[PDB]
C-alpha cells in the first residue's frame, strides 16, 4: 500500500560528463510519466549562467571588423555562445580577456577567479595572425533560467548604454541531450517493479544529483498548490499628542475639551469664534478631518480605544 524506498545512489561519470543514473523506486504504470516529467523539468527548470553582455575595446558594433583578427565578430560571438562558466559565490560576475601573440586564443586565456571556473580550456574562441595587436574584452555573466531574447532585453533596459557594448543572446539551457529508458529491476519480493536509466549530457554546469534535487524541488513547489490552496490608529490620538502647534493643544484642554469627539460634535465655525484659539487652526482641523473621510457634524463610530 505505502512505500518510501530511499534510493538514487549514483557516481557514474564514465569517460565523459555523461552520467548513467538509475531512477527508483518506480511503480507499475508510473515509468513513462515519471521519465517524461523528469526530462521536462531537467530541460526547462535548470538555470545556468553564460555569456550575456560583452564589450570589446576599439569596436563600434558587431557588424564591423578588427585588424589582426582572422575571424569576424559574429563568428566570435557564435563561438562564445557555446561557453559555460561555473559561478558559486555570487550571481553576476565580470571576466576579462587578456592574450597576446600569434595563435588560437581559447577560453584558457580569460582571467580566472577564485569562484569562476572554466569548463574546458581547449574551447577555441578566435585566432590571431599578428602579434602586434591583441584582443581584450569584458564579459558580464549573469544568472538566469529559460531564455531571454535580444528584442525583449533591449526594451527592458531603461538606461541607454554607451556605444561599444555589444548585445549577446544569453542561452540558459545547460542540458541539451537527455533520454530515459525503463527496464525491469531486480527486486527481492515483488518481481513486478523497475529501474529508469536516465542519461544526460551536460557541459559540466549542473551536477546530476543537484539537477535531480532542483527538479524535485520545482515539482513540489508547483504541486503544493493542490495541497495547501484547497481602524485608523492615528485618529484615536489626543489633542496633545496629535503633532500640532503649541496653541492648538494648550487652549483646547482648558474648555472641558480633551478628545477629538467633543471637537467634532460642535460646529467649527461656531466654536472657533471663542477668543482663545486662532483662525489658522482651521487648517489643522481640515487636515485631521477632511483628509481621513470625515464630514461636519458627523458622529464617530467607535471613539473610545
Amino acid at each position: 500500500t505505502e512505500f518510501l524506498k530511499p534510493r538514487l545512489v549514483d557516481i557514474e561519470q564514465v569517460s565523459s560528463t555523461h552520467a548513467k543514473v538509475t531512477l527508483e523506486p518506480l511503480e507499475r504504470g508510473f515509468g513513462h510519466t515519471l521519465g517524461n516529467a523528469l526530462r521536462r523539468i531537467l530541460l526547462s527548470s535548470m538555470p545556468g549562467c553564460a555569456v550575456t553582455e560583452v564589450e570589446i575595446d576599439g569596436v563600434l558594433h558587431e557588424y564591423s571588423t578588427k585588424e589582426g583578427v582572422q575571424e569576424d565578430i559574429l563568428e566570435i560571438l557564435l563561438n562564445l555562445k557555446g561557453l559555460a562558466v561555473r559561478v558559486q559565490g555570487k550571481d553576476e560576475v565580470i571576466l576579462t580577456l587578456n592574450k597576446s601573440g600569434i595563435g588560437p586564443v581559447t577560453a584558457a586565456d580569460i582571467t580566472h577567479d577564485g569562484d569562476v571556473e572554466i569548463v574546458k580550456p581547449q574551447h577555441v574562441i578566435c585566432h590571431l595572425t599578428d602579434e602586434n595587436a591583441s584582443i581584450s574584452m569584458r564579459i558580464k555573466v549573469q544568472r538566469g533560467r529559460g531564455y531571454v531574447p535580444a528584442s525583449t532585453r533591449i526594451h527592458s533596459e531603461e538606461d541607454e548604454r554607451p556605444i561599444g557594448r555589444l548585445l549577446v543572446d544569453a542561452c540558459y539551457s545547460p542540458v541539451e541531450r537527455i533520454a530515459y529508458n525503463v527496464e525491469a529491476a531486480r527486486v527481492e519480493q515483488r518481481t513486478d517493479l523497475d529501474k529508469l536509466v536516465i542519461e544526460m549530457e551536460t557541459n559540466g554546469t549542473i551536477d546530476p544529483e543537484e539537477a535531480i534535487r532542483r527538479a524535485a524541488t520545482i515539482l513540489a513547489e508547483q504541486l503544493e498548490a493542490f495541497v495547501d490552496l484547497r481602524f485608523d490608529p492615528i485618529l484615536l490620538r489626543p489633542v496633545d499628542d496629535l503633532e500640532l502647534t503649541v496653541r492648538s493643544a494648550n487652549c483646547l484642554k482648558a474648555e472641558a475639551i480633551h478628545y477629538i469627539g467633543d471637537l467634532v460634535q460642535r460646529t467649527e465655525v461656531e466654536l472657533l469664534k471663542t477668543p482663545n484659539l486662532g483662525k489658522k487652526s482651521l487648517t489643522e482641523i481640515k487636515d485631521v478631518l477632511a483628509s481621513r473621510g470625515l464630514s461636519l457634524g458627523m458622529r464617530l463610530e467607535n471613539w473610545p480605544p
Binding site: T245, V246, R247, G278, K279, K280, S281, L282
Partner: protein, 106 residues
C-alpha cells in the same frame, strides 16, 4: 512669544499669499490676530507703516522679475500686488528715483 506666535505666521502668510493686497480687514481674519495683534508687532519688530513695508517687499520681489528678461512689463506689477500701473510707477519713482525701463534694461 508675542500674541501666541504671530511672527512665525505673518512671514508664512506673506510668502504663500497671492498678489491680493494686505489691509486690516484682509489680514486680521485668518491671521490668528486682531488689529492690536498686528499693531504691537508693526511698532516693535518693524517700526514702519504697512503701506511702505508692503511696497518695499513688492519692489524687492519685482527686482528679480525685471532682471528675468520679461517683455510683459504691464503684468509684472500686477502679478505681485500692484493693481494699477500708475501706482507701481509712482512707488518706484518715489523709492529709486529711476524710470522703469532704466532699471529693466539692467
Amino acid at each position: 512669544t508675542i500674541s501666541a506666535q504671530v511672527i512665525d505666521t505673518i512671514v508664512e502668510w506673506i510668502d504663500d499669499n497671492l498678489h491680493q493686497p494686505l489691509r486690516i480687514d484682509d489680514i486680521a481674519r485668518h491671521a490668528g490676530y486682531s488689529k492690536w495683534h498686528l499693531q504691537r508687532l508693526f511698532l516693535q519688530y518693524k517700526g514702519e507703516s504697512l503701506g511702505r513695508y508692503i511696497r518695499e517687499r513688492k519692489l524687492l520681489l519685482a527686482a528679480r522679475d525685471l532682471r528675468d528678461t520679461d517683455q510683459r512689463v504691464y503684468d509684472i506689477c500686477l502679478k505681485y500686488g500692484f493693481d494699477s500701473q500708475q501706482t507701481f510707477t509712482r512707488v518706484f519713482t518715489r523709492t529709486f528715483n529711476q524710470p522703469p525701463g532704466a532699471y529693466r534694461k539692467e
